[PDB]
Design a protein around this ligand. Structure first.
Ligand code: HEM
Ligand code: HEM
Ligand SMILES: N=C(N)NCCCC[C@H](N)C(=O)O
Ligand SMILES: N=C(N)NCCCC[C@H](N)C(=O)O
Ligand SMILES: C[As](C)(=O)[O-]
Ligand SMILES: C[As](C)(=O)[O-]
Ligand SMILES: [Zn+2]
Lengths: 416, 414
């Protein structure tokens, strides 16, 4: 039959063919010899600093392609405006070596990038993104203003709205606009003498980096870190977020009265700030985006990973579970209650959140929409299936083809 | 050339050099990753009506033999040299060859070791290999299968085993076991599409009744075996009940659980896969070990397209099945898995939970890193269906690739 990957759903027995992957203009880590699809950071997309301006030839075909996607999207492919915009980009790359995006094009690409993200299970919301254009930004101080504006609009007092702020693209031989923090909001990770980490172990490097840059470190388990903002060709500057802007949710359990006493909490706004936004060849090194959490992110990964808060044992001890034998499923039991606590605490606080069941169901809906609209949907199985109750969600039984489409969000090396 | 493999829990890294030995292609390409797919679109095992290019067969053979002699520290020895020549000799003359019992035993063990989707590979060295190549009838396969089951079950103290029937022969039909497992519960489609029993076995059940099997009418009716000898119609054989050990399911504290009347069989014995060694193919080589609790408690009993007992348990647990955020599914899945573990332990039948199983697999990875410089593993299949990131394997990157000897899927005989 069809000469594209055959994708099957084992729960429903249905079949589909992905023809969209034929559009993938970039390779991944896989080869007929071995599958490296479980690797978190395979050296493939990696947007390593390529300082010396890019092959005018390469950037052109990448730009020619994006512009086609844009006119296609507004149903004007082949129009006079399309060709003119085409000649316009070529000319500008001819004389300056680079080019710029019109307002509407930036909005279109930001959305496509989210739309194209293989690891995002919340893409059914892709068409509803607020795009803040901050391409005029020219100082670390100004970056801080936009970021604060972003957090204010995105948080919206608990009724969270997806958003993205776009700072100046990379320029020939010039410094990049960079946000050193991985997320606009993160908790400190303090390296202790005995060797342990107080707070979040994932943020130890960035925590010390702030200290080295003048931040007076605290000593709590949930200290909100300051932002290290770097304008072109300048050392990063330090900025502390107005506490009132950072909305947090204390965690309590619906029926375990002692859980609230654990003093656990989490911030409501998940805002990735270290990824690179790539559109038509142009690279936006600073372009923080945010949506709203899926309960397992906080409840299972953040609070229970061995290398994070690792609270599983403490909660199980409080639940009086037999933690000396794997077969008592003490880990499974404590993980459930903790996730329940997170969901319950957000609903009480009236802060937007979605459980892993609702989330995956809507992603199945998104896959159907995309099958029709584009002939497929790039998806990373290991990342789409939740960290708990995997097979209990519909995505587990859905095969998925993973590949890279552009516009795209890519990982980039740390500025330091 | 050599992939870096990281464990995000410990920050450790390793380089997989074993994949260089991979001589078989997967479904992945630089353009897109199809690793989440269960069955190969082309990596099948096409017919054997005409011999296989001697060039090909011969090279796989020389490689396997070389493998076999390295394993017993007699590489380049005299015996080794004379074995290669025997194989060269037989192939040139008949277009095929035959393995010696000891090579077969070695090959079977390696096939399991190379099984990317198996989490219990730490046991790969402990496998009882029954040579059943001296089989000429379906009636004989049945006695062999019965002995395998008796031995493997060992009154609850399960022991891993494999039984190897005659290899495929060009132009001749295959010895086949139609059933996917030696023990499966019938799936009876009612009238209105619903199904009584295991929905996964509807087809095999229908084929049985179509060959003279008198169907039962329960949810856990042990199916008969449809054994087939070359170019013959499959024959029906019912398994002696005293031979099929089962475990009634009950819960530690929830007195009512037993009411549900749920049960499962002790022996997980796959029978529709193909064993390949030195280019030779064993179309009927049933193998077995013991269950990991999740296969039963999560997949077989909770999958939507399987027994799908999730809602019944939740209602009995008097949980709020009105909304998803109540995590009633997660809570009920946990108790059902606890019940399987409890029930199996009570009945003194071997079983391993997913926490213990994945811990042992991590050790296997390390053992294999030193022994071969890598270990082919399929992440999606190695990480359990529940409590994924709560186990060490979730946080471990993995490389998937095909090594031979190997167990492979093959077309359905009908
Ligand atoms: C509206 C709610 C949204 C939900 C609930 C959602 C949920 C998720 C989840 C569960 C992941 C994986 C998290 C992890 O395992 O670390 C993810 C990844 C991702 N999401 Fe979404 N997402 C949403 C909004 C957004 C938005 C607004 C964008 C971009 C404009 C976006 C872009 C991405 C990207 C790029 C990744 C992968 C990041 C990485 O590689 O670490 N998401 N999302
Ligand atoms: C000692 C106990 C064993 C345990 C606990 C174990 C556990 C598992 C599990 C959980 C899977 C995935 C099952 C699924 O999701 O359908 C698996 C797959 C597999 N195992 Fe094992 N295993 C054991 C013994 C064996 C033995 C003795 C062999 C062969 C000699 C073997 C060969 C395989 C193969 C080929 C697969 C993949 C089957 C497929 O593609 O569907 N395993 N094992
Ligand atoms: N819900 C969203 N938008 N998630 C984006 C992923 C990064 C958040 C991270 N997993 C965390 O738990 O903080
Ligand atoms: N534990 C073992 N040996 N598993 C092998 C796979 C076949 C069993 C299947 N998953 C089932 O649930 O029946
Ligand atoms: C409840 As705490 C120990
Ligand atoms: C146990 As029934 C309700
Ligand atoms: Zn792959």
């Amino acid at each position: 039959g069809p000469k594209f990957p055959r994708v099957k759903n084992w729960e429903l027995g249905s079949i589909t063919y992905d023809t969209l992957c034929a559009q993938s203009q970039q390779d991944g880590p896989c080869t007929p010899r071995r599958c490296l699809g479980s690797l978190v950071l395979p050296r493939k997309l990696q947007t390593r600093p390529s300082p010396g301006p890019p092959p005018a030839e390469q950037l052109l075909s990448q730009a020619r392609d994006f512009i086609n996607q844009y006119y296609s999207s507004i149903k004007r492919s082949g129009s006079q405006a399309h060709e003119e915009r085409l000649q316009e980009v070529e000319a500008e790359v001819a004389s300056t070596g680079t080019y710029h995006l019109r307002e509407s094009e930036l909005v279109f690409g930001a959305k496509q990038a989210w739309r194209n993200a293989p690891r995002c299970v919340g893409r059914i919301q892709w068409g509803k993104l607020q795009v803040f254009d901050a391409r005029d930004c020219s100082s670390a101080q100004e970056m801080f203003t936009y970021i604060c504006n972003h957090i204010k609009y995105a948080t919206n007092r608990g009724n969270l709205r997806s958003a993205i702020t776009v700072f100046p693209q990379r320029a020939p031989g010039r410094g990049d606009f960079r946000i050193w923090n991985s997320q606009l909001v993160r908790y400190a990770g303090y390296r202790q003498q005995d060797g342990s980490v107080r707070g979040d172990p994932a943020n130890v490097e960035i925590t010390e980096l702030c200290i080295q840059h003048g931040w007076t470190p605290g000593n709590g388990r949930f200290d909100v870190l300051p932002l290290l903002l770097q304008a072109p060709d300048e050392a990063p500057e330090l900025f502390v977020l107005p506490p009132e802007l950072v909305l947090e949710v204390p965690l309590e359990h619906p029926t375990l009265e002692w859980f609230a006493a654990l003093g656990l909490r989490w911030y409501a706004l998940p805002a990735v700030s270290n990824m690179l936004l790539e559109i038509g060849g142009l690279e936006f090194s600073a372009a923080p985006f945010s949506g709203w959490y899926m309960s397992t992110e906080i409840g299972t990964r953040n609070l229970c990973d061995p290398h994070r808060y690792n609270i599983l044992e403490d909660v199980a001890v409080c639940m009086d579970l037999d933690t000396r034998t794997t077969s008592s499923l003490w880990k499974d039991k404590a993980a459930v209650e903790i996730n329940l606590a997170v969901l319950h605490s957000f609903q009480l606080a009236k802060v937007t959140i979605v459980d892993h069941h609702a989330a995956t169901v809507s992603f199945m809906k998104h896959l159907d929409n995309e099958q029709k609209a584009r002939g497929g949907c790039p998806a990373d199985w290991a990342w789409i299936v939740p960290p708990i109750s995997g097979s209990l969600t519909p995505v587990f039984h859905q095969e998925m083809v993973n590949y890279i489409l552009s516009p795209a969000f890519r990982y980039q090396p740390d500025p330091w």
